[PDB]
Design an enzyme around this catalytic site. Structure first.
Site, mmCIF file in Angstrom:
data_model
loop_
_atom_site.group_PDB
_atom_site.id
_atom_site.type_symbol
_atom_site.label_atom_id
_atom_site.label_comp_id
_atom_site.label_asym_id
_atom_site.label_seq_id
_atom_site.Cartn_x
_atom_site.Cartn_y
_atom_site.Cartn_z
ATOM 1 N N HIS A 41 -1.586 -16.671 -44.752
ATOM 2 C CA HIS A 41 -2.953 -17.606 -44.334
ATOM 3 C C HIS A 41 -2.359 -18.986 -44.132
ATOM 4 O O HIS A 41 -3.027 -19.910 -43.617
ATOM 5 C CB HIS A 41 -3.546 -17.654 -45.682
ATOM 6 C CG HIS A 41 -5.110 -18.042 -45.183
ATOM 7 N ND1 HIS A 41 -5.790 -17.413 -44.406
ATOM 8 C CD2 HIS A 41 -5.737 -19.114 -45.747
ATOM 9 C CE1 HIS A 41 -6.984 -18.119 -44.440
ATOM 10 N NE2 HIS A 41 -6.861 -18.984 -45.150
ATOM 11 N N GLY A 143 -5.774 -24.738 -54.220
ATOM 12 C CA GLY A 143 -4.405 -24.826 -54.085
ATOM 13 C C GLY A 143 -3.364 -23.873 -54.613
ATOM 14 O O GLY A 143 -2.226 -23.991 -54.631
ATOM 15 N N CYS A 145 -3.142 -20.708 -54.133
ATOM 16 C CA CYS A 145 -2.846 -19.503 -52.930
ATOM 17 C C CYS A 145 -1.267 -19.508 -53.167
ATOM 18 O O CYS A 145 -0.533 -20.348 -53.162
ATOM 19 C CB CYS A 145 -3.194 -20.003 -51.646
ATOM 20 S SG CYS A 145 -3.439 -18.379 -50.475
HETATM 21 C C1 LIG Z 1 -11.179 -21.508 -56.219
HETATM 22 N N1 LIG Z 1 -9.909 -20.825 -55.609
HETATM 23 C C2 LIG Z 1 -9.538 -19.866 -56.702
HETATM 24 N N2 LIG Z 1 -8.364 -19.411 -56.185
HETATM 25 C C3 LIG Z 1 -8.214 -19.937 -54.842
HETATM 26 C C4 LIG Z 1 -7.119 -19.697 -53.970
HETATM 27 N N3 LIG Z 1 -7.135 -20.295 -52.893
HETATM 28 C C5 LIG Z 1 -6.468 -21.380 -52.185
HETATM 29 O O1 LIG Z 1 -5.767 -22.008 -52.993
HETATM 30 N N4 LIG Z 1 -6.598 -21.769 -50.864
HETATM 31 C C6 LIG Z 1 -7.496 -21.341 -49.892
HETATM 32 N N5 LIG Z 1 -7.628 -21.753 -48.735
HETATM 33 C C7 LIG Z 1 -6.898 -22.702 -48.309
HETATM 34 C C8 LIG Z 1 -7.422 -24.115 -48.051
HETATM 35 C C9 LIG Z 1 -6.318 -25.117 -47.646
HETATM 36 C C10 LIG Z 1 -6.639 -26.365 -47.472
HETATM 37 N N6 LIG Z 1 -5.378 -26.771 -47.000
HETATM 38 C C11 LIG Z 1 -4.918 -28.359 -46.732
HETATM 39 N N7 LIG Z 1 -4.426 -26.073 -47.431
HETATM 40 C C12 LIG Z 1 -5.110 -24.937 -47.454
HETATM 41 C C13 LIG Z 1 -4.570 -23.433 -47.978
HETATM 42 C C14 LIG Z 1 -5.612 -22.576 -48.380
HETATM 43 CL CL1 LIG Z 1 -4.589 -21.121 -48.698
HETATM 44 N N8 LIG Z 1 -8.354 -19.923 -50.434
HETATM 45 C C15 LIG Z 1 -9.187 -19.364 -49.479
HETATM 46 C C16 LIG Z 1 -8.564 -18.165 -48.923
HETATM 47 C C17 LIG Z 1 -7.033 -18.223 -49.078
HETATM 48 C C18 LIG Z 1 -6.867 -17.081 -48.099
HETATM 49 F F1 LIG Z 1 -5.240 -16.580 -48.399
HETATM 50 C C19 LIG Z 1 -7.499 -16.204 -47.708
HETATM 51 F F2 LIG Z 1 -6.812 -15.247 -46.865
HETATM 52 C C20 LIG Z 1 -8.853 -16.495 -47.214
HETATM 53 C C21 LIG Z 1 -9.405 -17.530 -47.944
HETATM 54 F F3 LIG Z 1 -10.624 -17.698 -47.804
HETATM 55 C C22 LIG Z 1 -8.251 -19.640 -51.851
HETATM 56 O O2 LIG Z 1 -8.766 -18.659 -51.917
HETATM 57 N N9 LIG Z 1 -9.254 -20.873 -54.722
#
Ligand SMILES: Cn1cnc(Cn2c(=O)nc(Nc3cc4cn(C)nc4cc3Cl)n(Cc3cc(F)c(F)cc3F)c2=O)n1
Ligand SMILES: Cn1cnc(Cn2c(=O)nc(Nc3cc4cn(C)nc4cc3Cl)n(Cc3cc(F)c(F)cc3F)c2=O)n1
Lengths: 301, 301
Positions: A41, A143, A145
């Site tokens: 991702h 953050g 992920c």
């Molecule tokens: C509330 N919560 C609980 N667990 C998580 C894990 N999580 C995450 O950490 N990040 C995500 N989206 C990103 C946005 C970014 C913005 N910037 C600058 N960089 C980013 C990197 C990510 Cl990875 N997501 C959402 C998400 C991550 C995926 F790997 C996916 F396949 C689908 C998704 F909807 C996330 O859930 N957040």
């Protein structure tokens, strides 16, 4: 004595976490030997996140599009490949703190330790179980992920989970370290529903044995039940089937406590039918199902 | 989302644990710079354990009576002194993995991470609270003496607990890292009773705020109470007094959720008076009191 939600010491894993950035998208990676593993991702821009075509996105990338930071030191990416839902970034430096390790996939009902991580920096460690519906009830913020789940056997770290996303119910979904999702989930930023969950029956019985080892015996009774008469009541309460293999695995705990498994099952039937009535077991007022028989033997030696 | 019993990553502490042996008595030590800290109980033979005179026992020892093993490497003891209930063994080698650290004493109601350790080898990590009666409800087996509890702030490890013994109720007693016991306990192998415990009220309120942040709101109500009318009911239920400082500390959580502290107190009064009625809060069927307001902000950012 005592019984706690106990994780494995996280040091061997802390020494493997790095930050991976592609464009402005950033997340956590796992640095083992000369490879960094992270959720694919990361190659999504904010506009790719809803409906990515990952093969398209990755062929448009080169090694210099990936910023890997191991704390202070920037790691030079010299190769990239994609394996299911994980990206592999070959770097020019082998991690000198690489532990002995394996990539193992776990079964629903099994437990593991989670090292929650943000911008490559470990934040906290906790224990959890893979639910029967292939979600985990984790604790994760934005953050997180790329954070990993693991068990340790002797000195070998068995990596079993890499965190990807949070579902609308607040539970969590991810992959094994080969990039294959647990459960019917896909790595897109779309709302996806977990199926109905069940209670892990063999774990509840293991925890009742832990209670007896620790002197909690009030829930015991002189009754016994048959396997099928137990399974008839328990499944009315959304409990999963208890197989003879489950009875077999509970053997050592039954031996150490002198309580037959189907005797313990008679206790569980009454707890399900009557509730717990203002009383607690090992500090909990409900039937705990995220301790495996091995976890109990580990902690109640 | 999600809320778990989360410990600090244990790596910085794992790199400091060693085994200390005097005669045939063995336990865990903490190696920081060129000093190893461990329970002075190690200088007891089995016959000294019931009623030791520690000044007598130690003057009969020399540096060569202490075997310190840092995994494989034997550390040469070049000096020894006793500070309250901890022994300090100066070794000829500074620990190259010494983290930035402090020795801090914690207050009842505060939480910390425990690295459970056996023969100098870390086994597991978990979170716990110092109870109002100065015991901890840990998980420890034979051989755990000398295991340490700690918090981490930025990169600094604040050591706050060194484990000594298990009381007859199965709870645990120990010292700060200056060797001063928490509570009215002494390092003798005699049965000692913990005083009556109470529930940590400010922590229960913090955890109710964590629930609201995570979408658990069923226990909320439109009522409010005064501080003194709350304290009149709560203390009937063996809860500790709620001071204005406690209300002040809960300020940020009250602001983030928009629920006044005395409004949350009205919820807690009803939960105490009516029970929880087949419902759960953050996966628990009782009122959890081992999460501080800081722990909640940490995990619910
Ligand atoms: C509330 N919560 C609980 N667990 C998580 C894990 N999580 C995450 O950490 N990040 C995500 N989206 C990103 C946005 C970014 C913005 N910037 C600058 N960089 C980013 C990197 C990510 Cl990875 N997501 C959402 C998400 C991550 C995926 F790997 C996916 F396949 C689908 C998704 F909807 C996330 O859930 N957040
Ligand atoms: C069940 N449990 C839970 N926590 C503990 C901690 N604990 C411990 O680990 N060891 C202890 N006594 C020893 C015996 C030894 C035998 N050999 C060869 N070496 C030994 C070292 C110890 Cl330290 N104790 C008992 C105990 C330890 C003290 F430090 C003390 F001041 C009084 C005590 F009664 C113990 O509780 N066990």
């Amino acid at each position: 004595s005592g019984f706690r939600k106990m994780a494995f010491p996280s040091g061997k894993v802390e020494g493997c976490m790095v930050q991976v950035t592609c464009g402005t998208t950033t997340l956590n990676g796992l640095w083992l030997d000369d490879v960094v593993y992270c959720p694919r991702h990361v190659i999504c821009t904010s506009e790719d996140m809803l409906n990515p075509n990952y093969e398209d996105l990755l062929i448009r990338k080169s090694n210099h599009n990936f910023l890997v930071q191991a704390g202070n030191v920037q790691l030079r990416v010299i190769g990239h490949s994609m394996q299911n839902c994980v990206l592999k970034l070959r770097v020019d430096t082998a991690n000198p703190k690489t532990p002995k390790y394996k990539f193992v996939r776990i079964q629903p009902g099994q437990t593991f330790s989670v090292l929650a991580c943000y911008n490559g920096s470990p934040s906290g460690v906790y224990q959890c179980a893979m639910r029967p519906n292939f979600t985990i009830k984790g604790s994760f913020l934005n953050g997180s992920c790329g954070s990993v789940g693991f068990n340790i056997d002797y000195d070998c770290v068995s990596f079993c989970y890499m965190h990807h996303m949070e579902l609308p119910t607040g539970v969590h979904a991810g992959t094994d370290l080969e990039g294959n999702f647990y459960g019917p989930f896909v790595d897109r930023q779309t709302a996806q529903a977990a199926g109905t969950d069940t209670t892990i029956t063999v774990n509840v019985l293991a925890w009742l044995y832990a209670a007896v080892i620790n002197g909690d015996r009030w829930f015991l009774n002189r009754f016994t039940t048959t396997l099928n008469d137990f399974n008839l009541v328990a499944m009315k309460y959304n409990y999963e089937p208890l197989t003879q293999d489950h009875v077999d695995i509970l053997g050592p705990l039954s031996a150490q406590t002198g309580i037959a498994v189907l005797d313990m099952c008679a206790s569980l039937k009454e707890l399900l039918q009557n509730g717990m009535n203002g009383r607690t077991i090992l500090g909990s007022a409900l039937l705990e199902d995220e301790f495996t028989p091995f976890d109990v033997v580990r902690q109640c030696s």
